[PDB]
UniProtKB/Swiss-Prot annotation:
Carbohydrate attachment residues: 352
Residue numbers binding chitin: 67-68, 94-97, 137, 202-205, 343
SMART domains named among the record's database cross-references: Glyco_18
Disulfide bonds: none
GO MF term (any one): endochitinase activity
Source organism of this protein record: Coccidioides posadasii (strain RMSCC 757 / Silveira) (Valley fever fungus)
Gene that this polypeptide is encoded by: CTS1
Protein name listed in UniProt: Endochitinase 1
Gene Ontology biological-process annotations: chitin catabolic process; polysaccharide catabolic process
Pfam families named in the record: Glyco_hydro_18
This protein's GO CC annotations: extracellular region
Keyword annotations from UniProtKB, A to Z: Carbohydrate metabolism, Chitin degradation, Chitin-binding, Glycoprotein, Glycosidase, Hydrolase, Polysaccharide degradation, Signal
Location of the active site: 136 (proton donor)
Positions of the GH18 domain: 3-366
Length: 392
């Protein structure tokens, strides 16, 4: 099989960030996760922003087309699929903000079947190749077990749909999973893997404003000489997943397209007070805004981690450089992993300095990516333009 190039497209990015689907370099990805749909206490899944998802008209969208029609980012996602038959889209449900809405509907058969039914309905209507569930994070045993039951319900819904369309494609079921031991150790990994096409390992946010010491937020390996600079490592998580019975080729390594800052610090692994500003929110900086003026860049090739430090401001920022992106690529190849995933599409640089481009090339180029045709046929969609293949 080949490597997967997965990226999250955030629906709120069309606003302040001015990032639209048409800005995506389709050729460098194999999967696009459209984030995030919300969940009703009954189990019913629904689009979070009607304006961004379905109502907004982009250049080329007519006003007098016959029948029921969809526009917004949904139409743009389908248009990319038309141009790149190897490009798949998934409807991403949950996310950090919406995560508290899982427990209730997941706790019972009714809510789970409802979740499975509504998500499938949206998938078949909106033209997605599958669904992705981001639950952050199951708090205990019960939730942990209900998660497996939820995945079982969705897998059956997606399969039953395929059965009714023999010559059509198969649909995907994926989830974003934790890289922190305390979170994944309570998950029935082996049991869950039976229903999943692949896992999107969130190997980031290892350190941040919640800490007492500054650290690397997405390192592959731990630091031996300076333990305190690495509270976590992605390698530790990869090994544990594999030991839990999950196949390495199904694990996609997540990577950040942003950096986390630490103020008033001597350097990596020392105390900090505050996080200063950010590109949009305090303490978080888009990769495209790096490096800042006055900062020296340090790259630790052995643990695959880099950061910037301004001696005058005593300001530290943990983010990946192209060089470090290259090291993670090597890690993926070495361990026969499923590929790379990024959060999120708006903050990367364009061209030679793109983190995604670096990884993809490090993976062997487009030719080494997974080749698996997407689905364009949606005969059961309630939208006329969609089922007619967005002809215009």
């Amino acid at each position: 099989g080949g490597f997967r190039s997965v990226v999250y497209f955030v629906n709120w990015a069309i606003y302040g960030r001015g990032h639209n689907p048409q800005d995506l370099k389709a050729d460098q990805f194999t999967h696009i996760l459209y984030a995030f749909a919300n969940i009703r206490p009954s189990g019913e899944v629904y689009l979070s922003d009607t304006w961004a998802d379905t109502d907004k008209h982009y250049p080329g969208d007519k006003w007098d087309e016959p029948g029921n029609n969809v526009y917004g980012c949904i139409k743009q996602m389908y248009l990319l699929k038309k141009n790149n038959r190897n490009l798949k889209t998934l409807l991403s449900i949950g996310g950090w903000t919406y995560s508290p809405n899982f427990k209730t509907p997941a706790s019972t058969e009714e809510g789970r079947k409802k979740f499975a039914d509504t998500s499938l309905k949206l998938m078949k209507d909106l033209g997605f190749d599958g669904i992705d569930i981001d639950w952050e994070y199951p708090e205990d045993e019960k939730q942990a077990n209900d998660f497996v039951l939820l995945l079982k319900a969705c897998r059956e819904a997606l399969d039953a749909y395929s059965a009714k369309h023999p010559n059509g494609k198969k649909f995907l079921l994926t989830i974003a999973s934790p890289a922190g031991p305390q979170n994944y150790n309570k998950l029935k990994l082996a049991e869950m893997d039976k229903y999943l096409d692949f896992w999107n390992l969130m190997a980031y946010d290892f350190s941040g404003s919640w800490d007492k010491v500054s650290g690397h937020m997405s390192n592959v390996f731990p630091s031996t000489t300076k333990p305190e600079s690495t509270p976590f490592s992605s390698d530790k998580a990869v090994k544990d997943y594999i030991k839990a019975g999950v196949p390495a080729n199904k694990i996609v390594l997540g990577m950040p397209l942003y950096g986390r800052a630490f103020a008033s610090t001597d350097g990596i692994g020392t105390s900090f007070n505050g996080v200063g500003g950010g590109s949009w929110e305090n303490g978080v900086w888009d990769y495209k805004d790096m490096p800042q003026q006055g900062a020296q860049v340090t790259e630790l090739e052995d643990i695959a981690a880099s950061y910037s430090y301004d001696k005058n401001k005593r300001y530290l920022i943990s983010y990946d450089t192209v060089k470090i992106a290259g090291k993670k690529a090597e890690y993926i190849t070495k361990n026969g992993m499923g590929g790379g995933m990024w959060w999120e599409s708006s903050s990367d640089k364009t061209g030679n300095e793109s983190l995604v481009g670096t990884v993809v090339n490090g993976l062997g180029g487009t030719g080494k990516l997974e080749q698996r045709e997407n689905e364009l046929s949606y005969p059961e969609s309630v939208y006329d333009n969609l089922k007619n293949g967005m002809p215009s």
